Amino acid sequence: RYNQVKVDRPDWHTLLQKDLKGVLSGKDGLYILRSNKVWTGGSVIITDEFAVTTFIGDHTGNFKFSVKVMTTPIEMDYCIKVIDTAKFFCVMVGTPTQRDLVKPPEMLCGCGALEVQDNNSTGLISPGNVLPSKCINGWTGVVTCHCPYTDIKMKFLENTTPQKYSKNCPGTYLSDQNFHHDCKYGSQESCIDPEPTKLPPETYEDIQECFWCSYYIKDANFTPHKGPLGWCRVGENEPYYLTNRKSCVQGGVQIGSGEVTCLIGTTKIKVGNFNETAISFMPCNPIKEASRGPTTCTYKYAKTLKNKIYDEKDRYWGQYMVKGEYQYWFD
Amino acid sequence: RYNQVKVDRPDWHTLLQKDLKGVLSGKDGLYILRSNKVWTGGSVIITDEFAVTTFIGDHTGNFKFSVKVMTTPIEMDYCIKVIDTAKFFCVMVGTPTQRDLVKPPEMLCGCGALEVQDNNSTGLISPGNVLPSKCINGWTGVVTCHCPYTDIKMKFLENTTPQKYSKNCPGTYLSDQNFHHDCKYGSQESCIDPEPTKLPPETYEDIQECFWCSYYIKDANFTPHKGPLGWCRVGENEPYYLTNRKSCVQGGVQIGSGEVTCLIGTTKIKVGNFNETAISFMPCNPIKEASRGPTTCTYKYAKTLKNKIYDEKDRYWGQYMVKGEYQYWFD
Numbered sequence A, B: 001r002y003n004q005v006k007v008d009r010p011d012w013h014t015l016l017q018k019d020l021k022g023v024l025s026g027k028d029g030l031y032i033l034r035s036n037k038v039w040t041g042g043s044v045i046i047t048d049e050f051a052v053t054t055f056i057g058d059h060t061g062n063f064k065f066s067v068k069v070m071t072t073p074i075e076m077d078y079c080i081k082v083i084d085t086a087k088f089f090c091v092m093v094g095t096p097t098q099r100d101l102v103k104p105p106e107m108l109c110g111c112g113a114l115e116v117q118d119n120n121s122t123g124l125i126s127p128g129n130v131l132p133s134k135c136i137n138g139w140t141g142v143v144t145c146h147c148p149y150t151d152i153k154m155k156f157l158e159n160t161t162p163q164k165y166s167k168n169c170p171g172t173y174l175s176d177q178n179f180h181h182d183c184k185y186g187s188q189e190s191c192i193d194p195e196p197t198k199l200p201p202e203t204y205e206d207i208q209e210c211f212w213c214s215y216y217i218k219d220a221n222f223t224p225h226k227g228p229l230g231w232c233r234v235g236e237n238e239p240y241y242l243t244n245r246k247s248c249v250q251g252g253v254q255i256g257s258g259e260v261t262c263l264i265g266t267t268k269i270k271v272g273n274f275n276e277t278a279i280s281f282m283p284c285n286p287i288k289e290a291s292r293g294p295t296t297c298t299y300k301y302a303k304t305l306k307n308k309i310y311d312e313k314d315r316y317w318g319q320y321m322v323k324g325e326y327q328y329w330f331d
């Protein structure tokens, strides 16, 4: 139990008049620490690099405590010895040199700062006082504590084999839109080198909904474009996967936040002039407008951007019928 | 007078019973010719290489004649001598060695054929028996007669200096359309190397009527083409001069004998499809057609050839409005 000396608990009275210092009894033995006691009323606070213990003794000579932990110890319990008498009790339990753990427990090191030895140059464990409970999918090496004033080196976590996967800790990352990414040395809590997960080939017919250019495609119909594109969700209530990388600027036209409402399949979209003098084809299908009032000339028309022409040529004239900011198609 | 022996005329009776032969008395003297007489009734025909004389003597011993000329003689008269008596009369006068003459008189050479010596390789005087009265603008050299049986060489025409121009004989040629051409060694009768006469520069505004592609331009308006073109007449009742050489095939379109009537300025023309799949612009202005019956859509239209488009773009659509074999322009 990482203890060596028999534990004797003084009374509340002996605790007060006597001097107390924090100690570290292991297999090697007791290590003295520079402790300063504080007692005015019914409160006794011993402050140490390792921890801060508050002694509240209002009982019939009995004493109780609580501990604020500055640094977790390894393979040695943090006890309190009475100076000049054998009364030695043990307050803090301590923890082993935990090794080979994915999602390690948060181990504090206050006395000084941690030194990391990342094999494979993982650059995963951030430096400083604390070792967070960051999920560690793949990592190898040793993390050690240190303190300049007293050279105490404590091994918190050594990984020999890389345990890549944990049940509650994938090697994947999910964005806020459930966008599936793959982490080379990271998890959901902290992910190194995320690379989107590509959708499996030949399962495009299976996919239901896609997302692209700030617009959520409904039912994956995009008649003016090659199926599929963007981030696509297979089934429902599942994450999205990367399919086809297409720019949101087909020439000098931008999808979203635009002057001109049109259609990419069923989904209603807005389109705006990126380049004023860019001559390219509209990236969406047009909206029809019935102008047959009071047969006569019946045409259908759609609003269009400057120098931008929808793909449909007028049948009657075999030519792109445009005048002003409108395109027409006669019956 | 190219004669040497005193002229004595026999009676009609002496002429008949006696033998007669043709002679050539010059400065050198008399040359005998192989003559054969013919006498049945009142007709005496002496046949010679030089000439054929018919003697008709029904008078009181008087005799008269006429002469068919086979070969003109030079510097010696052709007389008839009576064989065995001194009676020698002279029938044909003869002609000198004419030289330096533009439009020389027609000189016959029957006995043989002419040999030409064209200096400057004119190739103007055609070979053979006759020397026509071809107008000779520029020529130098000698033309001589010859006869194989009897070697008589007679100089008909020697040119020393080239007399290029005669009052009734220009060095120009006029076509049936009064198309002015210029002859290097020819006249209107016979023209060598004709080269059209170009119209003087800067007198294009002055010219009235032009001719091009089987169509006579009236008043030299050709609005779809650069003024002027073809053969143009300055003033009136004057010849035409060569201005601008333009093909009658602007792409795959032919002026004249065509399906489609149109206009090159004021003149009405016909146009036909040279190349079925040639894509070029019409070479004429279109004809308008009022289709405003029972406001409404009013358009004007002109018939056009396959893949041929008139220059006028429709104003309303800024595009070449074509459907079938018709082009339209809306008001």
Ligand SMILES: *[C@@H]1O[C@H](CO)[C@@H](O[C@@H]2O[C@H](CO)[C@@H](O[C@@H]3O[C@H](CO[C@H]4O[C@H](CO)[C@@H](O)[C@H](O)[C@@H]4O)[C@@H](O)[C@H](O)[C@@H]3O)[C@H](O)[C@H]2NC(C)=O)[C@H](O)[C@H]1NC(C)=O
Pocket (backbone or CB within 6 Å): A274, A275, A276, A277, A278
């Ligand atoms: C949309 O894209 C356009 C094309 O990229 C942007 O403007 C054009 O940009 C190109 C190159 O980026 C320029 O090309 C240069 O042209 C000059 C000659 O320019 C001048 O002369 C021409 C002919 O008269 C005239 O059209 C121009 O307006 C200039 O007056 C060359 O010397 C260079 O080497 C190079 O080839 C274009 O000139 C430029 N202008 C035009 C009208 O295309 C445009 O700015 C973009 N729009 C936005 C909002 O960014």
Ligand SMILES: *[C@@H]1O[C@H](CO)[C@@H](O[C@@H]2O[C@H](CO)[C@@H](O[C@@H]3O[C@H](CO[C@H]4O[C@H](CO)[C@@H](O)[C@H](O)[C@@H]4O)[C@@H](O)[C@H](O)[C@@H]3O)[C@H](O)[C@H]2NC(C)=O)[C@H](O)[C@H]1NC(C)=O
Pocket (backbone or CB within 6 Å): B274, B275, B276, B277, B278
């Ligand atoms: C009017 O002019 C036209 C163009 O001069 C005449 O027909 C065309 O003539 C050109 C050359 O004289 C040919 O060019 C050759 O093309 C072949 C390839 O030909 C084949 O493949 C193409 C593409 O599919 C297809 O369009 C053709 O019809 C052929 O099936 C090359 O291998 C040669 O090296 C050369 O480049 C054209 O192919 C030919 N045809 C067409 C449709 O343009 C036409 O005949 C003229 N009209 C009259 C009445 O004379």
Ligand SMILES: *[C@@H]1O[C@H](CO)[C@@H](O[C@@H]2O[C@H](CO)[C@@H](O)[C@H](O)[C@H]2NC(C)=O)[C@H](O)[C@H]1NC(C)=O
Pocket (backbone or CB within 6 Å): A119, A120, A138, A139, A140, A161, A162
């Ligand atoms: C990190 O890199 C090493 C290679 O540099 C990977 O494999 C190790 O290779 C060395 C040299 O042969 C062996 O001694 C180690 O035992 C190997 N590690 C094993 C087998 O786990 C190693 O797999 C890499 N780690 C990660 C997480 O990618």
Ligand SMILES: *[C@@H]1O[C@H](CO)[C@@H](O[C@@H]2O[C@H](CO)[C@@H](O)[C@H](O)[C@H]2NC(C)=O)[C@H](O)[C@H]1NC(C)=O
Pocket (backbone or CB within 6 Å): B119, B120, B138, B139, B140, B161, B162
């Ligand atoms: C024909 O060609 C000659 C040149 O080969 C032209 O000029 C003659 O030149 C020779 C050589 O100097 C002179 O001896 C002649 O007297 C020149 N002829 C003249 C002066 O008439 C000649 O002009 C040409 N003729 C034509 C009709 O073009």
